[model samples]
Target: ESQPDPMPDDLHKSSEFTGTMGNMKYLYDDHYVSATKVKSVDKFLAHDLIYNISDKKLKNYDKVKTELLNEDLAKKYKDEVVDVYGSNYYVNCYFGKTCMYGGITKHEGNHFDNGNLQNVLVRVYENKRNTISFEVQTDKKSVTAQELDIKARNFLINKKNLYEFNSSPYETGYIKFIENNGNTFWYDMMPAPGDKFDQSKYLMMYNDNKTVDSKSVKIEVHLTTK
Candidate 1:
């Protein structure tokens, strides 16, 4: 029997994720939340991904901190924060008017259980922008999407001029989308002659649109190996 690749004891505990949102400006109403009544034809406005600590409409910072320190997530959260920001970086985690969240995981080796077979999934919320992003820091010759829907695949391979080699953290290649079908499958070092280079990072955008709700919004991410 072919020997299987060694797996990490805890996948989540083996990888480190980090990002930051930059400074931004938006209109807020008397309630100190984002204004809902801008009197123009509803259209997407281009804004660079930016965020800051003082921006509100979010959660209570102290309350958020208390929850993060709980048993289940405290170690990863604390480890990554300190790894990125240094030993005294603890205070910054709880600092700001807008509630921000992040964490770290420490493991001895790469987190992928299957060699070169990994997946990263992300979701973005309506109206809210997250300048924070994720990256995979590996070097490979080429990559391909094993399960991305044809619509998204065509959109990246044909409809857009956004494909590039070695942009951002992607040593192989990069592709981005303003809209996607909520899931994508990427494989590293595909064997074909003309394989598209792996997307070291992918970007998805969720704009302020008709389907958005007035309360809170969120984006979910799932990075896994098959």
Candidate 2:
């Protein structure tokens, strides 16, 4: 077993292993992907030497990771509201500012029918550290931020809006809540231009720069959370 596990005879086509000596003399070894493509016997030997380390490590990596990323996001969000506001906004005429995953308010726009303020807010909270659009990214470091992101994804995956609000005759801030039927819920939104501004619906207004062709907005009947 002292001899190296000779290169594949076809190693020449295996990414040009041919040097002046020809075959078996490949350049730097590329690591394995799915199936291990051994260029030099050294790699297999290397893996063999350290493979048992994981067996004796005894600690589960995923479990360790979660603890490092705690789940008390709401509690953690106390002083870290700015972190959620860290998310950029997609200014839709109707929806005002939307905290989207990838400028993807697909579930958000159309009058905020899909996921309203909390939906977008949750997006901000979720991606507070590393925002997205498959484009923009915060990519910072915060365990609470990671947890919130997971929670936001659940709502998006479930295709449910967070918080629900009704239009009031008088504008009294973009959001107003009451304990009704023993459930507390809040929706985020801005009223029309003509209506008196209640100072606003959102807290951070990630991109408060509200714009409109004729002042846009949308809503639903009720909002209850579980």
Candidate 3:
């Protein structure tokens, strides 16, 4: 297909192509002319696109990092400790800063959760400079890590939250969740915000069980424009 001729840099009232011209002519005229009866472009701009950019992408991106809890100590004392010392292991995990895809960062926000039998780190990176990757590292001798890794991987696959966008006419962005050696990796081309922030609940489940040990998780989300 060829490009339409540029619209002149002037404000001029335009009317619909009332079947007076052929398809090609209509394309050119419509491309350049501003119609009198604005259908829904302005409304869509206000409702769908603009609101998504401002409210959904900006204000709705939740940033929460809860105080770590030690389930082992909690169960031992039959009480909950919000300020567990070693619970700070999984202090930082990051989603994309902007809505666009780019290189991954190893900043403090990358370590979302770590456990006694497994040291888990969530990573989103670019492979071969094109393929983007989301990885969960559950390290060391821990069967619990393997179980958690697979569970999380399959959970994301089932929910399909890591791929869908918070905008209209959802496009080609998607994610692939894979499991290997107590690690769950997510390969995503274009990652976008979903309708809600329940992604934090699973990532923050390190202290849910005593058997999970000193394993704890934290999530820090930041959304901004460059």
Name the best candidate (by lDDT).
3
Better of 2 and 3 by lDDT: 3
Which model is ahead, 1 or 3, in terms of lDDT? Answer: 3
Tens digits of lDDT, candidate 2, 1-226: 1222212231112112112211101100110011011111111111110011111132311110000012232123222212121122123212111221111111112232332322213212221232322211222221122222333323332342221222222111112112222322232322224322222122132222121111111111221121
Give all TM-scores, in the order shown.
Answer: 0.18, 0.16, 0.19
Model 3: which ten-residue window has the lowest total lDDT?
42-51
Candidate 1 lDDT, tens digit per residue, 90-203?
223322322212211222332344445333332411123432233222111111111121122223223222122221121122122222333322212111122231111111
Which lDDT values do the candidates have, in the order given? 0.21, 0.20, 0.23
Cα displacement (Å) at residue 178, model 3: 18
How far is each candidate from the true structure, as Cα RMSD in Å? 21.2, 28.0, 22.5
- Per-residue error for 192 in candidate 2, Å, reads 13
**TM-score: model 3 vs. ground truth:** 0.19
Residue 138 displacement in candidate 3 (angstroms): 5.2
Candidate 3 lDDT for residue 118 = 41
lDDT score for residue 8 of model 1:
35
* Clashes (candidate 2): 7
